[PDB]
Ligand binder design. Sequence first.
Ligand SMILES: CC(=O)N[C@@H]1[C@@H](O)[C@H](O)[C@@H](CO)O[C@@H]1O
Ligand SMILES: CC(=O)N[C@@H]1[C@@H](O)[C@H](O)[C@@H](CO)O[C@@H]1O
Ligand SMILES: CC(=O)N[C@@H]1[C@@H](O)[C@H](O)[C@@H](CO)O[C@@H]1O
Ligand SMILES: CC(=O)N[C@@H]1[C@@H](O)[C@H](O)[C@@H](CO)O[C@H]1O
Ligand SMILES: CC(=O)N[C@@H]1[C@@H](O)[C@H](O)[C@@H](CO)O[C@H]1O
Ligand SMILES: CC(=O)N[C@@H]1[C@@H](O)[C@H](O)[C@@H](CO)O[C@H]1O
Lengths: 6, 416, 409
Amino acid sequence: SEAAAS
Amino acid sequence: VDICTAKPRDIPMNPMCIYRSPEKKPEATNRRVWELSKANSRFATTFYQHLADSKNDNDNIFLSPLSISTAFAMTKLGACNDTLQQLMEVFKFDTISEKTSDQIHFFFAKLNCRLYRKANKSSKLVSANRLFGDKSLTFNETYQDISELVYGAKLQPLDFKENAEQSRAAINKWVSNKTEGRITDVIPSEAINELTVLVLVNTIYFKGLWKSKFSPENTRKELFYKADGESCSASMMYQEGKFRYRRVAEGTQVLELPFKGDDITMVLILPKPEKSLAKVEKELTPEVLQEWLDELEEMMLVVHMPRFRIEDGFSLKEQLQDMGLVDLFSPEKSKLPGIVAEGRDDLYVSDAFHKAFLEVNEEGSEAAASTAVVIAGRSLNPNRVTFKANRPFLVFIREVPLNTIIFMGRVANPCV
Amino acid sequence: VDICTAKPRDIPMNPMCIYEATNRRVWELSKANSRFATTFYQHLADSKNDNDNIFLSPLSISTAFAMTKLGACNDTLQQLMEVFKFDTISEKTSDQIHFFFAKLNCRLYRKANKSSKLVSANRLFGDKSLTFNETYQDISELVYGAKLQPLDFKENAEQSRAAINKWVSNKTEGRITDVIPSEAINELTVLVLVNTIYFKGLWKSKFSPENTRKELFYKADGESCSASMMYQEGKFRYRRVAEGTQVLELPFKGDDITMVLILPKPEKSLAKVEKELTPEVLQEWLDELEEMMLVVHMPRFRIEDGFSLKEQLQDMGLVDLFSPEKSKLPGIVAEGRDDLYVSDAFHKAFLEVNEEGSEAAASTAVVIAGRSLNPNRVTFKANRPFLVFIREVPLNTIIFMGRVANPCV
Ligand SMILES: CC(=O)N[C@@H]1[C@@H](O)[C@H](O)[C@@H](CO)O[C@@H]1O
Ligand SMILES: CC(=O)N[C@@H]1[C@@H](O)[C@H](O)[C@@H](CO)O[C@@H]1O
Ligand SMILES: CC(=O)N[C@@H]1[C@@H](O)[C@H](O)[C@@H](CO)O[C@@H]1O
Ligand SMILES: CC(=O)N[C@@H]1[C@@H](O)[C@H](O)[C@@H](CO)O[C@H]1O
Ligand SMILES: CC(=O)N[C@@H]1[C@@H](O)[C@H](O)[C@@H](CO)O[C@H]1O
Ligand SMILES: CC(=O)N[C@@H]1[C@@H](O)[C@H](O)[C@@H](CO)O[C@H]1O
């Protein structure tokens, strides 16, 4: 799983 | 003086204003950072309920509550009066009884220290904060210092007056970089103009591998049943093994899939085919979700979970407003005197945007398949529990030791 | 004289009756042994419950009957050539096969490296009152390192049986303790030809005991039993093939001896794979394996199998040898007896697998003129079995083969 947020 | 090992007395907050949280009504970890974790989750769950309610049942949803909490907690540093109060209430920081608004930040630094341990771990969980101010303005020295000391946010000067666009391209480049390219164009072209003085930004990036492998060889196409009563073809990952699980109210299934390291996991909430996910969401209370998590027990089962990519982006202004955060957005009522020094005390937030990315599959890589799994001499109980996620479900990626919800969302359509 | 080094003529083979080049010969024999292996396994499989364990060393069995063939004649000799496929080796004389079998054994058990232990020990047991033909005795000792030990079968069948089983136990680090059943040997027993093989290798990639977990294993008809499942992640020569059948190779230190596991797709039956097994089918698979990163789950276990070989072998072609009327083994006893036939032949194998590596042992005893014992039996059918092979790569020899079904021990 790869997750990113901004 | 390292904040991660500092005593509250080694870190002077000198806040412009203070708010006293009203009076209320474990496991070898820190009492305070544990309470802040609880707070962030109350905001997480609540905000998610709101967001999902304004969303159509066929839409995927994904975001980072931690990211949001962190950004606004950063903004609270210069908040005062009713803006300061609302911030404390909406983000539930006021539920850490009789604690002053300035102490929250010390606890938040301690929470961040644990979260981004960076130790010789297996899964990667990093975070990056930064303040982009106009080169011409003069920001508060304490605001500048504390933003750096507590949240590691530097103050990079940009030229919003003359080159807003060039400044916007700078910000976007930074975020893209801090998110391994997964988050691009966070800030809309329209936004950021000559009157823009501050752009506060938080980024969170995660990448982990499954502790229990989903062999690509076993992935196959299966029908997914959307909310609109129709179906579509999805890539279904398959495996059998032991995972913490629990059948809760009305046949809803809760499953935890850990990543290498055990520190972080993925929790899935799958309602029985009968019950609609909208109901589970409406009932998904902070205390309910917590009960469910505590009831998970290791158990042998079959897992049917789709591969999928989710890209969500939206403005937080409306949702946050309906939740009680009004002053912050009002040019007339906003109180942020502790941010910009000398004048311009009627500074307010013009907009707040969130953009999140999520990819789930076997190897974690988008490349082809280079792995397999061989299980010899296995004979499981013919009556083993089965978890088949071919209908909308909820997803969370949490840091267990702290019980922090790093990301959350809904997979309403994993199809292609 | 050392046969390993010697050449065709340097060894005076004087068999009574009859019916690189040394390297291509040895190879052809390895193929012959392989052929017998898969064929015998299928017949053996038909006599068992698809959910029962099956372990055996085809090589051991092939060696004991080769040894026995040194005194065979007529059809008996011929049938022996065909049943064990020695008759497919580019030769002319039934006696030449022995020279290459010696060459093989030489390469199999005599090496410098010896990263893994693989030993063999053959021996003959003749009645203390008979005069055994001297050529047969000398040739058996030369070609198979099998000395003829005296035993009093006429007055002490039991003392003797225990004696032989004990000799076998000594050559198998005590893993094979009762190759010969209780009443298999009696006063009329003339000779007992025996083979033993002992192996013990270390995983080239051992498993960590820390990663081993208990797991409920459900027996087909019935309940469960706790099982120790090992876990490891790494690169292995692997390959998923037709109908979802997986072929996985686990090499031992040195890479000259490996263990090949074969498993059907879940819910698909193994019997289908066994019915299509063949030296070539197996070779096909072995050639398709590719290096791959994979997770391997495999139980810690040991299985022991024992049985008579008479039935299976007769159905395969060996009829005469067991017939008190048609059997023709004139080249064994010079004076003392003359109606020699095999009453029975027993085999017993042992396999143990753990984190450090693997351990296997076997033995075959061909009993002459003894009492034909009725087929023994120990049924405990389990479930979802996988095939296993422990072969020596350079020599293309299947040392051990079987079906692991009960990982509960
Ligand atoms: C906000 C802060 O930095 N604290 C001081 C406060 O202690 C002092 O009384 C005041 C002058 O009266 O100047 C600052 O506000
Ligand atoms: C409502 C308002 O603006 N006035 C008060 C101000 O008198 C007080 O000194 C300050 C300290 O937090 O809190 C508010 O700003
Ligand atoms: C001792 C005896 O019984 N005579 C035969 C002999 O004629 C034959 O040449 C030899 C070859 O195997 O086998 C036996 O020795
Ligand atoms: C690890 C990676 O590939 N990401 C790159 C990094 O190599 C580079 O140092 C950085 C700018 O300093 O930009 C990132 O996007
Ligand atoms: C530079 C400036 O405007 N002075 C204020 C100062 O009066 C106040 O004590 C401090 C606390 O936040 O914040 C500064 O910005
Ligand atoms: C059936 C039988 O005993 N007859 C033949 C005999 O004529 C022959 O001289 C001898 C030589 O090997 O082989 C025997 O099998």
